[PDB]
Design a binder for this molecule. Structure first.
Ligand SMILES: [Mg+2]
Ligand SMILES: [Mg+2]
Ligand SMILES: [Mg+2]
Ligand SMILES: [Mg+2]
Ligand SMILES: [Mg+2]
Ligand SMILES: [Mg+2]
Ligand SMILES: [Mg+2]
Ligand SMILES: [Mg+2]
Ligand SMILES: [Mg+2]
Ligand SMILES: [Mg+2]
Ligand SMILES: [Mg+2]
Ligand SMILES: [Mg+2]
Ligand SMILES: [Mg+2]
Ligand SMILES: [Mg+2]
Ligand SMILES: [Mg+2]
Ligand SMILES: [Mg+2]
Ligand SMILES: [Mg+2]
Ligand SMILES: [Mg+2]
Ligand SMILES: [Mg+2]
Ligand SMILES: [Mg+2]
Ligand SMILES: [Zn+2]
Lengths: 178, 119, 57, 134, 177, 74
RNA sequence: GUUGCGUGGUUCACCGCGGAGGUAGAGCUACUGGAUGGCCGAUGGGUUACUGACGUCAGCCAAACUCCGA
RNA sequence: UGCCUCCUAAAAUGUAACGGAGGCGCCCAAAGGUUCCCUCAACCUGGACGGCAAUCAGGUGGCGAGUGUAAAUGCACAAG
RNA sequence: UUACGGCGGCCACAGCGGCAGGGAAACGCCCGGUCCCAUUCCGAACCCGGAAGCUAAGCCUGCCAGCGCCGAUGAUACUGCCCCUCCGGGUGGAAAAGUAGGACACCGCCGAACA
């Protein structure tokens, strides 16, 4: 039983009926998935992402990722169709709540010269997306046993209908805004 | 939404296997309908759209059967097998309904092959 | 596929230099992830030319 | 006037029969040249009939050409026997049926405008008349 | 107040209509308000008189073999060469109904500097009742700078008249040179 | 000179048995490219989309959800 | 085409019925192209009276255009 | 100069010219057989390197994508 | 008989969108991943076991013509066969576009509550 999930349905779940006037308890927003991908564009050359971009997201998120292939060829990017260019992991259920705790508690203040996250990064429906620096911040990968550094970007997908309905939800979970 | 996705996705899986499987007057079609609480089944005769026999888990005989939902699928599978033979049917074609053959539906189908129907 | 391809993800205790500690589930072997900065001992979680001419004179 | 692309470089001749059904009333201006018989009005015959409208009213008003030469016609070389392929395109042509309105015009003076369109009718290989807005 | 004595057609077709235009008269139909359409003959030259001198919105008072009937004129079919009416589309009006009708827009005024005045549309559609109050819509132009254009919005329309087309149709436009 | 002039043979496509016409079992009804018509009751498709007959009867045409079909009333 | 032997209205004409089309015409904010005048202005050109993409209001064109259709 | 698709070809089929445009002398051991499952392109909003356009996330989108290969007829029920 | 579940006919006069309302059984979301089974990663989907929560969504019923669809009559274009020198005329067919208007579907069988 992860601590962020039980803290959600103890006081976060009740507080959103006061900030927003819902008439039914099924309308209360809830984060449904957290999607993480590297997006390794330097894999159209050198063919080394199995050792470096799969062995680290397995350690960060818990489960092995999916290798994503290119949909169309681009001549300017030195790319084909069906070429491994992206590496995605999807987090559901109870491993989502443990990743959102472990991101906001011990990970996210290890960004070099960290000052916050911006609250204008909503897509219009209530789904936040930020990005990170490198194979730093997460302790589960070590800095000594790795290849070249590479960053990622993290989606957070809610059931909220609008923007600030998802801003009030992630402020309560523990995303630092400004 | 996911409740509107599941209706549209299973009646598209249901139309795909319907192009090739229709069923006639002497070989009717056993149509299953699987919800979370019960299953319904009926023999449809796709030439004038006329159900000749039907059985369901919402009637009083299937409701008082102990066990899980597969055992209540076996009981309703035995009812429409012995109601098809009261109308002169002994061979049918099996309509998946868009679902996956396995679990409760394969327990309905295998309990209807033991009791007379020859699909 | 949820069998013997995923790495080891067992329960884990994390301590901090401040004294805050909690228990989650991570991939670190031994359950001994140790941080030096956390969500309570970090800043931002807890907080002209005219004035320099006057300071010279 | 010449189209910058056409799909089919060598076409048949457009067919000269029937009364026109589109572009039969004056839509933009107040005075208009209406055709009364068939021809292939070319692009040279339009450029010659527009600069004879402009240098009679000399300023003011507006000249519309709601006719465009987008139908090619070909020509074999000169001292040539019949039939070694269809020739290369030479002319550009609009298909003009009776009833069709070729040039339109607004101008304040009813006399100079009706007499400027007459100097353009004598540049056209048709019999044409000047109709007004009702 | 436009009396016009009509009559009901005996036989109807391509042949019987060519024997009516050469015999002076002109064919038309009277429909609308759920009734079945009558197939009737207009006097030709007399109906052409009440169109040049009362616009295309003259409320006619047809005399269908003794019986009296009021009628507007929905559409015409001008022959492209003879420029004569071939066919009228008359519709009934029972003394006040909000009908959809287009009506002309005229231009009054001048322009001071070198300014060309080109008006695009000759008519806008309105809604109005029976016997014809509405007529052309006088528009004043003082000839401003060519960043000012006149629209169907801000039009001078009387009471009982409501604009139905669009409040953004460019009706009068002024430019340089 | 020209670069044109070659064509192919004419393949004699089209409806070979019209509506109401009594056919035998096995008769080629609508020879075509693709499915301009679709097969219905007692009509099988064929390799090059030939739409033959499976049982003797009379040809009748109809509509079955946008696709126009050939059937045989036995 | 003629002629010998078979078949006998099966040929053809008209009337009624059951059927497939994409010509003529027309239409195109229904597609692929061509293209006229307004309006809005991404870009390009020297801070802009030159270029005017895409859009939109009207009027149009087509043997290898077709939502239609004798 | 043989073969394949269109227009000419006059709404069944067929139809000439040193008439108008284009393809072929292959390719695939899966791009075949079968059983199940899925919906595309384009546009818009948010995102480390990342740009008009790589991978992600969400809206919109009924066929404008796709079809080993030319064109026509087909194909969203998919033949993708 | 019905503010009800299925299976078909039919494939826009039936679609899209907007505004209200409905939970007896049923369809549903929904709580879980020990068991068959499952994800090119994920109990999201598929499958299984449940009945704490609720009509917010789906679905069902009612109401609007905004967009989309249907659409005559009459006229016109074109046309068969004639008359005739072209132009046109006689006779038999007759569109497309637009207009008046239609339209927020209609019917068959089984089950459940009724009756
Ligand atoms: Mg036209
Ligand atoms: Mg060649
Ligand atoms: Mg051919
Ligand atoms: Mg073959
Ligand atoms: Mg007939
Ligand atoms: Mg016909
Ligand atoms: Mg064709
Ligand atoms: Mg034509
Ligand atoms: Mg176009
Ligand atoms: Mg333009
Ligand atoms: Mg055509
Ligand atoms: Mg032919
Ligand atoms: Mg023919
Ligand atoms: Mg295969
Ligand atoms: Mg396939
Ligand atoms: Mg209930
Ligand atoms: Mg679940
Ligand atoms: Mg509700
Ligand atoms: Mg008619
Ligand atoms: Mg129509
Ligand atoms: Zn600390």
């Amino acid at each position: 039983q992860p601590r962020l999930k039980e803290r959600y349905r103890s006081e976060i779940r009740d507080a959103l009926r006061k900030q927003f006037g819902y008439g039914n308890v099924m309308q209360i927003p809830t984060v449904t998935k957290v999607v993480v991908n590297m997006g390794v564009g330097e894999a159209a050359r050198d063919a080394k992402l199995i050792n470096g971009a799969v062995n680290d997201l397995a350690l960060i998120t818990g489960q092995k990722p999916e290798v994503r292939r290119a949909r169309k060829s681009i001549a300017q990017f030195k790319l084909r169709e069906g070429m491994p260019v992206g590496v995605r992991v999807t987090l559901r259920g109870d491993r989502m709540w443990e990743f959102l705790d472990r991101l906001t508690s011990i990970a996210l203040p290890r960004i070099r010269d960290f000052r916050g996250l911006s609250p204008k990064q909503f897509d219009g429906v209530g789904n936040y997306t930020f990005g990170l620096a490198e194979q730093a911040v997460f302790h589960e990968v070590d800095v000594d046993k790795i290849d070249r550094v590479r960053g990622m970007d993290i989606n957070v997908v809610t059931s909220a209908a609008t923007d600030d309905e998802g801003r009030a939800l992630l402020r309560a979970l523990g995303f630092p805004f400004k | 939404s996911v409740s509107a996705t599941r209706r549209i996705s299973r009646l598209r899986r249901h139309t795909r296997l319907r192009k090739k499987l229709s069923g006639t007057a002497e070989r009717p079609r056993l149509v299953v309908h699987r919800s979370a609480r019960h299953i319904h089944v009926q023999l449809v005769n796709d030439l004038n759209g006329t159900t000749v026999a039907a059985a369901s888990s919402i009637e009083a005989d299937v409701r008082g059967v102990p066990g899980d939902k597969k055992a209540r699928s076996v009981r309703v599978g035995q009812l429409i097998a012995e109601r098809a033979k009261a109308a002169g049917i002994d061979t049918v074609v099996f309509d998946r309904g868009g679902y996956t053959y396995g679990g409760r539906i394969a327990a309905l189908a295998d309990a209807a092959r033991e009791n007379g129907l020859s699909f | 596929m949820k069998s013997d391809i995923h790495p080891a993800y067992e329960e884990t205790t994390v301590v901090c230099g401040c004294g805050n500690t909690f228990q989650t589930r991570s991939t670190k072997p031994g359950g001994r992830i140790v941080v030096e900065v956390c969500s309570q001992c970090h800043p931002f979680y807890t907080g002209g030319r005219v004035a320099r001419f006057e300071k010279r004179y | 006037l010449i189209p910058r692309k056409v799909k089919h470089r060598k076409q048949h001749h457009p067919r000269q029969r029937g009364i026109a059904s589109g572009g039969t009333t004056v839509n933009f201006g107040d005075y208009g040249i209406q055709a009364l018989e068939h021809a292939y009005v070319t692009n040279r015959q339009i450029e010659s009939a527009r600069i004879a409208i402009n240098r009679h009213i000399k300023r003011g008003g507006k000249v519309w050409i709601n006719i465009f030469p987008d139908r090619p016609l070909t020509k074999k070389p000169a001292e040539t026997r019949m039939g070694s392929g269809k020739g290369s395109p030479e002319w550009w042509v609009a298909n003009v049926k009776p009833g069709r309105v070729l040039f339109e015009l607004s101008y304040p003076n009813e006399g100079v405008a009706r007499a400027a369109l007459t100097r353009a009718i004598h540049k056209l290989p048709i019999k044409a008349r000047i109709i007004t807005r009702e | 107040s436009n009396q016009l004595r009509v009559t009901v057609r005996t036989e109807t077709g391509k042949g019987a209509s060519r024997r009516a235009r050469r015999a002076g008269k002109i064919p038309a139909v009277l429909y609308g308000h759920g009734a079945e359409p009558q197939h009737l003959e207009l006097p030709g030259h007399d109906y052409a008189a009440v169109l040049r001198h009362s616009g295309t919105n003259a409320v006619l008072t047809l005399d269908i073999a003794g019986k009296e009937q009021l009628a507007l004129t929905k559409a015409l079919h001008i022959h492209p060469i003879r420029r004569t009416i071939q066919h009228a589309d008359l519709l009934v009006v029972r003394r006040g109904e909000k009908v959809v009708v287009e009506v002309s827009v005229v231009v009054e005024g001048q322009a001071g500097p070198d300014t060309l005045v080109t008006q695009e549309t000759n008519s806008i559609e309105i809604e109005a009742e029976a016997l014809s109050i509405p007529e052309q819509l006088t528009v004043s132009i003082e000839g401003a700078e060519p960043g000012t254009q006149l629209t169907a919005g801000q039009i001078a329309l009387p009471a009982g008249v409501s604009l139905i087309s669009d409040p953004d149709l460019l009706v009068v436009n002024v430019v340089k040179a | 000179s020209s670069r044109n002039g070659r064509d192919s043979a004419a393949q004699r496509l089209g409806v070979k048995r019209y509506g109401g016409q009594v056919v035998k079992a096995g008769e080629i009804l609508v020879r075509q490219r693709g499915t301009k018509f679709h097969p219905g009751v007692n009509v099988g498709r064929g390799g090059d989309d030939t739409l033959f007959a499976k049982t003797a009867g009379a040809v009748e045409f109809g509509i079955k959800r946008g696709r126009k079909t050939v059937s045989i009333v036995g």
